[PDB]
């Protein structure tokens, strides 16, 4: 079995959604020698816009921040086994799964 090393990376806005997808990949992978999950440093996406559409008033500013957390899972398996794992993993719509060979 040409055991390729696959790096699985998950970037998602909500910590509550991210932990659930992370748990499924760890849960599905106990049979396939899965390395434990790597938590990324939070990726801040701050945007600061003065709230007022017009220029009136002491410009007050909206700091709008989007937090990105990415999760690294190393797996040594066949090309099919990740596909069998896929049916079991609970798919949250819009969360990203990245297969890095």
């Amino acid at each position: 079995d040409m055991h390729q090393k696959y790096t699985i990376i998950v970037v998602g806005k909500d910590l509550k959604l991210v932990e659930r997808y992370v748990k499924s990949i760890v849960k599905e992978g106990r049979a396939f020698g899965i390395s434990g999950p790597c938590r990324a440093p939070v990726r801040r996406l701050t945007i600061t816009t003065r709230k007022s559409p017009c220029g009136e008033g002491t410009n007050t500013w909206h700091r709008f921040e989007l937090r990105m957390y990415k999760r690294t899972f190393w797996v040594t398996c066949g090309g099919n086994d990740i596909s069998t794992i896929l049916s079991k993993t609970v798919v949250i719509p819009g969360i990203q799964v990245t297969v890095e060979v």
């Binding site: 003065r50 002491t58 410009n59 007050t60 500013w61």
Partner: protein, 151 residues
């Protein structure tokens, strides 16, 4: 520089027996102790060597108040990353003093000896909650604003 695995990343083998953290003003100094021949070197650098020479006298405070028999023989290798310059020295001072405390270990009243050092210097065993604050809209600095034209 920032909370890494730099705690022991630099040294491989020769496991240094003691690991003691010292922190002042965003400066991290993990103290590694091997109980050698009077090596108090921190940052792989001599105690006498310092950024401010005058400041070194403050970092010799456990040495003067606590028995010198402790510093007479010891071994040290400290990874200090972060801090402007003087932040590093107090963090170093927190590290080494806690490192001497970790060495005392077995005597139950280790705290009683250490408190002579707290009485002479408080915060020599304690970490301050003082951290930089933030600016707000209309403010050049954290606790100011653009000078107001009309009351």
């Amino acid at each position: 520089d920032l909370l890494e695995r730099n705690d022991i990343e630099v040294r491989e083998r020769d496991k240094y027996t003691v690991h003691t953290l010292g922190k002042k003003k965003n400066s991290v100094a993990v103290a590694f102790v091997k109980a050698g021949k009077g090596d108090i070197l921190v940052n792989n650098v001599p105690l006498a060597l310092v950024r401010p020479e005058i400041l070194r006298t403050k970092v010799s405070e456990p040495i003067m108040i606590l028995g010198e028999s402790l510093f007479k023989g010891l071994d040290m290798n400290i990874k200090v990353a972060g801090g402007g310059h003087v932040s590093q020295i107090y963090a170093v001072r927190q590290a080494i003093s806690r490192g001497v405390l970790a060495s005392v270990k077995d005597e139950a009243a280790r705290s009683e000896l250490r408190a002579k050092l707290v009485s002479y210097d408080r915060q020599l065993v304690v970490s301050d909650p003082r951290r930089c604050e933030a600016k707000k809209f209309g403010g050049r600095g954290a606790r100011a604003r653009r000078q107001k034209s009309y009351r």
